[PDB]
């Protein structure tokens, strides 16, 4: 029916704004007029309420009725190159993420780190892809949304091809009809990437494919977040499959993409 952190209630009946970031509203501008127009939500432009700038954008749940939403973080890479040197030149010490890092596994940090009681960014984000599935298949589940209400962030070491497999089994609840749907969405989304001007001239980092479907049997996909979404310089293009190697700036989106489809026909196939 309707979404209602960075997300606030629209006047207009079925739109939701998000907090505006120019990273972010550079890309919606040009996906509107891209291939990949219809695989993200519409974008209206932008609108000013509290002395804030906010995206106006399509409420994807609106067409659902109790809508089941399960958010998915495409890539090998969830943060950009220039945090490695802003940590090599001016580390900015995260007490928080030492803390979520000891929480998991206390063998984790490095004697400096427990020193620090603090960890670098990009060293906590490096930890969270490879507990996770992120590093060897490219993507993770950040979080399910259930139409009982009920919603869970408990995927930090959702990792293996058959527990990813098992969490998409339990969000689709045996609905043939659903799963279905979903992997034409996904076959027609790799289509698109794969021809699209936008994709091959971007670095596609902390984006997420969104699923949604309800008991109707309704079922989509969309891409979502392109706040760290960032054009490569002089009309240089990425794979979206090779492996990263700092300075070639591949995030790996397309592998991700590849072995989730792969895992959603393998499910199909059960
Ligand atoms: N256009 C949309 N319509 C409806 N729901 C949306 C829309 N965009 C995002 N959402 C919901 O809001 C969540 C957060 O979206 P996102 O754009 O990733 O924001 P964020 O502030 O970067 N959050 P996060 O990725 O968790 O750090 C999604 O997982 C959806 O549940
Ligand atoms: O999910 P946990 O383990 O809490 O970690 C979050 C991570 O999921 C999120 O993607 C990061 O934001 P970003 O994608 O804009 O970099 C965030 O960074 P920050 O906003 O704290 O700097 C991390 O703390
Ligand atoms: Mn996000």
């Given at each position: 029916?309707?979404?209602?952190g960075?997300?606030?209630?629209?006047?207009?009946?079925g739109?939701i704004?998000?907090?505006?970031?120019?990273?972010?509203?550079?890309?919606?501008?040009?996906?509107?007029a891209?291939?990949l127009?219809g695989?993200?939500?519409?974008?209206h432009?932008?609108?000013?309420?509290?002395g804030?700038?906010?995206l106006?954008?399509?409420?994807?749940?609106?067409?659902?009725?109790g809508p089941?939403?399960?958010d998915?973080?495409?890539g090998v890479?969830?943060?950009?190159?220039?945090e490695?040197?802003?940590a090599?030149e001016?580390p900015?010490?995260?007490?928080?993420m030492?803390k979520?890092?000891?929480?998991?596994?206390?063998?984790?940090?490095?004697?400096?780190?427990?020193?620090?009681?603090?960890?670098?960014?990009?060293?906590?984000?490096?930890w969270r892809?490879g507990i996770?599935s992120?590093?060897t298949?490219?993507?993770r589940?950040?979080?399910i949304?259930?139409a009982?209400?009920?919603?869970?962030?408990?995927?930090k070491?959702?990792?293996?091809?058959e527990?990813?497999?098992?969490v998409?089994?339990e969000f689709?609840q045996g609905?043939?009809?659903?799963?279905?749907?979903?992997?034409?969405?996904?076959?027609?989304?790799r289509?698109?990437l794969?021809?699209?001007?936008?994709?091959?001239?971007?670095?596609?980092?902390?984006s997420?494919?969104?699923?949604?479907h309800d008991?109707?049997?309704?079922?989509?996909?969309?891409?979502?977040?392109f706040?760290?979404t960032?054009?490569?310089?002089?009309?240089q293009?990425?794979?979206?499959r090779?492996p990263?190697?700092?300075?070639?700036?591949?995030?790996?989106?397309?592998?991700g993409?590849?072995?989730?489809?792969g895992?959603?026909?393998?499910?199909?196939?059960?």
């Open positions: 029916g309707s979404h209602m960075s997300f606030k209630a629209a006047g207009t009946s739109l704004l998000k907090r505006c970031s120019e990273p972010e509203r550079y890309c919606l501008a040009r996906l509107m891209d291939a127009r695989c993200v939500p519409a974008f432009g932008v609108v000013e309420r509290d804030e700038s906010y106006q954008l399509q409420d994807l749940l609106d067409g659902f009725d089941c939403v399960l998915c973080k495409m890479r969830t943060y950009l190159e220039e490695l040197t802003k090599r001016r900015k010490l995260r007490k928080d030492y979520k890092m000891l929480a998991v596994d206390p063998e984790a940090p490095t004697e400096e780190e427990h020193a620090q009681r603090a960890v670098t960014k990009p060293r906590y984000m490096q892809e996770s992120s590093t298949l490219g993507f589940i950040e979080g949304k259930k009982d209400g009920s919603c869970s962030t408990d995927f070491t959702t990792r293996s091809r527990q990813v497999l098992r998409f089994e689709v609905d043939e009809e659903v799963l279905r749907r979903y992997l034409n969405r996904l076959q027609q989304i289509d698109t794969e021809v699209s001007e936008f994709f091959r001239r971007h670095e596609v980092i902390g997420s494919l969104l699923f949604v008991h109707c049997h309704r079922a989509g996909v969309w891409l979502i977040d706040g760290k960032t054009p490569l310089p002089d009309g293009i990425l794979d979206h090779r990263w190697e700092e300075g070639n700036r591949e995030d790996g989106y397309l592998l993409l590849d072995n989730l489809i895992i959603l026909a393998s499910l199909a196939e059960r």
